[PDB]
Amino acid sequence: MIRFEHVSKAYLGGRQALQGVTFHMQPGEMAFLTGHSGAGKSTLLKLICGIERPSAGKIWFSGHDITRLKNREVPFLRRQIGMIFQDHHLLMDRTVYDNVAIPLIIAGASGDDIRRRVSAALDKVGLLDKAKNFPIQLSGGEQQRVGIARAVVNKPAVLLADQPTGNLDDALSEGILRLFEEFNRVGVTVLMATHDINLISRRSYRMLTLSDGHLH
C-alpha cells in the first residue's frame, strides 16, 4: 500500500534528486518504474523503506505516515519490505546459508523450519550446489541473486527491487520475472525497477517513467 503526496528529497550537496512526485498504487500490483541515469528511482525506493528522510513532504505507507517516526520503530518497518539494493549488500564474513537466513533469525522462527524455507527460496532462484559457501567466491551474477533469495523469504507484504537482472542473462531474467509474477498472485505489492526495456515491454501493469522526479 504505497501512496505519495508532494514530497521533495534533497541531499546535503544541494542537488534536487526529486522535486515533485505524486503517485498512488493499489495493494497487490506490479510496477516497472524506469528512467535515465540522472533520475532518482533508487532513492525513490529508499524513501519507502525509511532509510532516507523525505525532508519536505508527506509519504503514506499502509495507514501510517513515515515522516516523523522515531528511530525505535524505523527498523520494524523494513521487516516486511523485501528490498534488494544497488550494490549487493551482503555479509561477506559469513556463509551464503546464514546470509539468506538473516530475516528468519530476525523474525524469530524455529530452527527446523529455517532450513526448509531457505532451501525453498534457493530452489526457485537456482542456488543449491553453491550453498554453504561464502559470497567472496560467488560471482556477481550469483551475489545479485543472493539478495533476491534474501528478499523473497518469510512472504513480505511489500516487495521492492532496483535493477535486478543486471548481471543476469536474458534466459534467466525472464524466469525470475515470472518468479516475481509467481509471488504476485498472493497479495504482494511489487515495485520492480530496471533500466532495460526489451524484457519488460512484453507486459503492462504500471509502466511509468521518471525524469528528474517528473512523471507525466
Binding site: 532509510i51 527498523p75 520494524f76 518497518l77 523494513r78 521487516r79 516486511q80 519490505i81 539494493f85 549488500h89 551482503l90 555479509l91 561477506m92 564474513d93 538473516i102 530475516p103 530476525i106 534474501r150
Partner: peptide
C-alpha cells in the same frame, strides 16, 4: 559492512 547490512535489513 556487517553493521550496514544488518541495520539496512530490518533488525532490532
Amino acid at each position: 559492512d556487517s553493521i550496514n547490512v544488518q541495520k539496512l535489513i530490518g533488525a532490532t
